[PDB]
Ligand binder design. Structure first.
Ligand SMILES: CCCCCCCCCC(=O)OC[C@H](COP(=O)(O)OCC[N+](C)(C)C)OC(=O)CCCCCCCCC
Ligand SMILES: CCCCCCCCCC(=O)OC[C@H](COP(=O)(O)OCC[N+](C)(C)C)OC(=O)CCCCCCCCC
Ligand SMILES: CCCCCCCCCC(=O)OC[C@H](COP(=O)(O)OCC[N+](C)(C)C)OC(=O)CCCCCCCCC
Ligand SMILES: CCCCCCCCCC(=O)OC[C@H](COP(=O)(O)OCC[N+](C)(C)C)OC(=O)CCCCCCCCC
Ligand SMILES: CCCCCCCCCC(=O)OC[C@H](COP(=O)(O)OCC[N+](C)(C)C)OC(=O)CCCCCCCCC
Ligand SMILES: CCCCCCCCCC(=O)OC[C@H](COP(=O)(O)OCC[N+](C)(C)C)OC(=O)CCCCCCCCC
Lengths: 293, 293, 293, 293, 293, 293
């Protein structure tokens, strides 16, 4: 908070009394279903030290959640998106540098609660025959309760070097049919990984017996639309005013297969089966303030 | 957050010191009961890279929740809106492209809570006859609690290609008569799908025995009014300054039938029975900045 | 959110650098107790496409909650407002159209919580005679908890056509004497519909035995004041610049009668007994920007 | 709160009607994986008393979470970041001084709840033989509940002297596999420190049996990006207008080793095993208002 | 709230259309580890009645939490900061006065909840021999629950006279090892004051057996940074325009000693053992609007 | 809310385009420890109807919590502030009037919750000898829960007449040693009023056995600083432009005495023992817009 040091709010920011030449580039990769788009902005504030360029890789990545293979009613497969990734890179010999990037790793908290209870009890028992009985008792109780919030997909910021910065979205865990949350490594000796399992012992065809995409999380089927910001600074006295950038939109899928053993379905997951990458190279012209490709 | 990179807030946005020519077009489709409307705005900022056009498909889609067929008191049917859809498409040969779209798939979270309890107990029992008894005990308890919020209708963003983008609204599940939430695939061996069932074993006429539309969710009967935004960019040097768009407002209904077997009502649901589509083609004139049709 | 597409906030709105000629018309209908009022505003922004007119039907509708008929102490009646309605309509041959309307159907959510508990137990029992006993036990528990918020009166938006748009307020359910919520269709074999019942088996006069209006919801007795907004657009090249509108403020009452059978009171409800409508026709003059009548 | 003393808000702040010359310097230390960056701003308000300079050490520090050594399946090690540190220092003979620093130690609160319950009980027991029995009882209960929120990593502000100021981020405790929170000093006689333990008695290779980095907290693997602000004031009449600063980005790792004793895995932690420091010296030129190096 | 009297918000404040000459003075007291700093501002609004001066004693006070003395493994001591204080004073003969001071005593609230429960019970017992038994029971329960939030350190405003005003921060109570909150006066017959005790009956060296500073509250080890505001008014017609102020940063430490009696550790606390004061005298020159020393 | 009537926000307020001459007067009453201060503002808006003057009686009142008398170890007393009061009055013959006053009586709410539970139970018992037993049971439960928040000190606004207006702060109730809240009228047959009691049956000296001021609420010891606003209007055509005001800062103390009967301490409270008043008379000069004294 800038106002917490007594500095008037907004004084230290950059971009006042200047003209910013924004832009936009959109490209669709039919092969991988990645509607990538980048929205840039050239800021050159005279009071600043270096020329600036903010790249916002909005785009969108499809889900690709479908049953790829079926072999009769005995067994069938399924491919689902294990994690989405997007990164920006620069040539090793380039002179520009990565300055900032908004979505960053943040610390996570958890509640905690301790309970202690003392008790006392006493009753008097009697019957018709005149018998009289008594009972005196006591009890103690100690309790620990711990609660926290865990999302289905967890965004991460990979260690950003000077030249390349990249994010990542992975599959934390999911709740199926209102049952206990499952994850890729979850295992049960009888049924196995029940992640995307419709019925434990249904009699339908194996390919049919898969969780309906609507029931599952949206990102699995309808894709994930990133919103990431990075800022690139280039010295104003550099001999060359042209730079090249590479943007990647890789998506990683997994193989989930359920198998009918004798009576019930058995689910197995094979992480990191396929990976799809869609890299496009853009060219930056600092002098003209336009990025084209 | 633009201010989190130290850039002055609002610097990177587009639309400053420019005149935007808005508009409006309203049309009602009596056949399907879809009061469709589009509210557009032409933004051509000199500091930007391409001409812009934002389309907000506000409109409204009716519910169409009524008992379509009745056959005596033995059985009767009912049609309800399973899902609402709206999408924008462009001709394959067009040069414009889809840039953005507001309502997007978002990650969902869930609470979690683990509990552990230790116990101790002891009592002394005595009677008139002088008998003295004792009791010492202990117990342990482990508990997992998981809570999350699930809406009745869940909006989704279908995988947006470069040329076409479309949303979708589906029926998650509903609570009937304060009873457990039901959904399309819910089944009970005795009664069956009790989704829109008034009384389990009422003696009234079959057509009468249906959940009152007021009790159910509003969207089922009174319709759903969308609010979706998309932005279309067209290069300023293109030879042709005219483009055509298509807007669709399809709505999908289901068939719900309850049947009197011997004593109680039995309910069955047949998903995706009917679909109603209302597509209108608009023409865009970038040079004059007006969309008409 | 306009700022979520990178457009500067407020750019796409209409009404900048223009003069709006507001107005006001108030009329009271003594027969039906409806203090109806409309607050209009003519907006004609040169950058827009059509002339605009926003109508805000503020007004107010009385409750009319009273004991209409009494027949000795054996039985008596009561009329209460089941639902309030207000709608705007245009002549079929008119050229203007309905564009927007603020209060719209919204999706409703519900919480959900699943619980699972394991237990263990063991005690050692002994007495004076040296007898020693043991006990080992275990238990499991499964719990589903579902919570949601339900208001007394639920506003709805009837399917809006091009020419007419109307809202509606209905009676969801009410809590009486801190007892379980009741509604119009609620029934109990012994007492019946106990909605507005003071005492189950009081000995007072039948007319007296009714819930005090203060205890009940406010809208029942003191009326409901609507706040609804609609916008009408008319093409700027139309031959005729005059339009007629109709505004209706209908209110629906129900008959609630309690009857002394032998020992306790019995309550019965007869929905949709009376309806009161108060329609006034206004005239719109686009050229002069004034609505009068 | 400035407005709480009746002073108009923002009156006492500094930075109005002045030009601030910002800047930026980025450097990457390949050896230690620390993408350090500093964003400075020279403020010289004529109404103020001294020249000002705010340094925001944004940067980023990698996680470095990996299995460094493995010796067959009997045992293997692991190094994880115990704490991240960053500090600014000035030469002892310098004339500038440290004025402020935003992230500061803050007081922490805890909930508290006391419960007291009285009880009464009575039952009548009878059998076919005509025997009649009674039971009267009472009980009391006292309960203390205390709850508070404890984050995984806890930022601290080391005692700031006049010349040097430094922050610190340490490892509070973590929740593993939904089990009770663990910390560095946690110990269990059977298993030991179960902090980063995959399975208690799994049969896999020792190196394999480690908690997946995705499951653990993000900062452990993907690094921690600091955001700390400090302000340096230098008198405007000083003979020398040049100052030197030192910025350090030390990171401390620990050694976590699990050992297979006879049947189950045993985990041991050795705090403060390695420390990595990356110090860079910057030069400040007050007269020209530029920091370079 | 100024707007609650119908006065336009901000009308009654002071500081509009005037120039405020701020300042800053920083000094570090190596002997006591108190990085004291004062940030002043001279406001002389022509519409006001007196000259104004707001002093914000930001500064910072070190924690000084360490084991001062150890005598073998039998016993050892510890000194921790019991309370931090800071006050401003004026000479008795001075003419200026204290007007305001932000952080002020505030009323504290507590929740409350009363519970009442009625019960009923009945079971039918039978065996093979045809014996039939019954049981009818009832019970009542009354419960009072009271919850409130209590911070570790509680800031107070000492009774402010005309000439001197001073704040105070004291040690409310702390939670150790997730156990019941402890305070200075807490006592246990077996162990004693268990405030900063690592293990109840550990076998390590006495000096070693102390709570790790990281586990404890931050203010204990890393110090407390105050933020207090006071405003001084001086008449504009006074003969002398020079005033002297004194600022004190006293810190009070306590002695905590744990002692090995025969088997377990015993902890004893001796409140108010040492006090450290660091007073500096500043000179105020109203005519020149500068405070120097 | 002004914007809820369609009036542009802030239109109806007073104070626009005018100059307000503020002020300040501070006086300390050594005898009673009341640092009283008044902050006035003369507003004369030409569009208004009367001259305005807002008086904000900020000031501060000391706590005066101490053991006044002790008589050996058998008994001792204590005086604590029961209630703080501040009021403004005008001479009866004056022409000015009291218009407004911010802190006003506000309605207080309470939660409420009704619970109902049905149960069922059944078990099968068997032993080695082949005996088989059964048990079928049921139970019902009704519960009322009511929760609300009650502060320690409750501010009130005494009935404001035309000439005088006064506030009041009283002692609602307090929580001692985490035990049930106590108040002035609380009584216990064995111990008595245990409000400020350290230990029930401690053996220390009577004067020593009193609750530590730090443990109690802050206002008891460190005093209460009021913040109250009132506005006085005087007609602009009045013959006399001078008015006199009286400001009072009375504080009421109570006598709390604990007495050693035979084994335990007994506490008694005598409400309204002493009262301290400090009234100062100010003179208002409307023509010159200055209040002096
Ligand atoms: C895997 C299990 C590892 C052992 C964990 C030990 C830490 C938990 C301590 C514990 O049980 O809580 C403390 C309780 C409650 O009493 P306290 O709060 O200590 O008050 C003393 C009253 N008392 C003498 C009648 C017992 O007092 C006790 O009963 C404590 C007795 C000494 C420690 C052993 C307790 C066994 C707990 C499983
Ligand atoms: C479908 C069921 C699959 C098995 C799930 C195992 C995971 C749950 C572990 C569990 O029951 O919780 C741990 C408990 C509580 O004690 P801990 O927290 O382990 O402390 C040890 C104290 N104790 C030796 C007296 C037991 O200690 C135990 O009693 C654990 C014993 C070893 C695991 C088997 C527990 C059976 C749970 C159904
Ligand atoms: C109207 C009632 C329709 C039936 C509803 C079935 C769905 C509910 C399943 C259920 O009861 O929850 C699962 C429980 C808990 O254990 P799980 O979480 O399955 O862990 C297995 C441990 N166990 C073998 C010792 C039981 O394990 C069981 O006991 C499940 C046994 C198989 C399903 C039948 C359960 C009967 C529930 C009324
Ligand atoms: C490690 C344990 C140290 C001792 C802690 C003592 C402090 C806790 C006091 C306590 O147990 O709570 C007070 C209860 C509840 O009654 P009160 O609220 O005192 O009302 C009196 C009614 N009664 C005479 C029928 C009992 O009344 C009592 O039963 C209090 C009796 C005197 C104190 C001893 C209680 C033993 C608690 C472990
Ligand atoms: C240290 C203890 C001091 C005594 C505290 C007395 C204040 C608490 C009163 C109390 O126990 O709550 C009221 C209950 C519940 O019934 P009520 O709400 O009074 O309804 C009457 C129904 N009844 C006749 C069947 C009892 O009705 C009763 O059982 C109240 C009977 C009269 C007061 C004595 C109750 C004993 C409480 C410890
Ligand atoms: C100081 C006490 C004054 C009396 C307060 C009466 C008001 C409370 C009524 C009450 O107990 O709650 C109603 C319950 C629950 O059943 P309901 O919700 O009435 O459903 C009827 C089912 N049942 C016939 C099997 C009982 O049904 C009953 O058991 C009600 C029976 C008639 C009223 C007497 C109940 C006694 C309560 C202390």
């Amino acid at each position: 908070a800038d106002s917490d040091i007594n500095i008037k709010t907004g004084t230290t920011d950059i971009g006042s009394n200047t003209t910013v030449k924004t832009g936009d580039l959109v490209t669709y990769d039919k092969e991988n279903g990645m509607h990538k788009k980048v929205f840039y902005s050239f800021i050159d504030d005279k009071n600043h030290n270096k020329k600036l360029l903010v790249i916002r890789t909005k785009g969108t990545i499809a889900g690709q959640y479908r049953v790829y293979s079926e072999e009769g009613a005995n067994k069938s497969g399924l491919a689902w998106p294990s994690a989405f990734k997007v990164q920006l890179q620069l040539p090793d010999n380039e002179v520009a540098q990565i300055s900032d990037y908004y979505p960053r790793n943040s610390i996570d908290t958890k509640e905690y609660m301790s309970t202690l209870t003392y008790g006392f009890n006493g009753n008097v028992t009697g019957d018709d025959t005149g018998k009289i009985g008594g009972l005196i008792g006591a009890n103690v109780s100690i309790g620990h309760t711990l609660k926290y919030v865990q999302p289905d997909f967890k965004t991460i910021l990979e260690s950003p070097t000077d030249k390349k910065v990249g994010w990542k979205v992975i599959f934390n865990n999911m709740v199926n049919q209102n049952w206990g949350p499952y994850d890729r490594d979850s295992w049960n000796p009888v049924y196995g990984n029940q992640l995307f399992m419709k019925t434990r012992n249904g009699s339908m065809k194996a390919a049919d017996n898969f969780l309906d995409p609507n029931k599952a999380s949206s990102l699995l089927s309808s894709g994930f639309s990133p919103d990431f910001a990075t800022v690139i600074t280039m010295d104003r006295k550099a001999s060359k005013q042209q730079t090249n950038i590479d943007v990647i939109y890789e998506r990683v899928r997994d193989d989930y297969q359920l198998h009918w053993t004798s009576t019930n379905w058995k689910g197995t997951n094979t992480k990191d089966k396929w990976t799809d990458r869609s890299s496009e190279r853009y060219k930056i012209d600092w002098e003209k303030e336009e990025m084209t490709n």
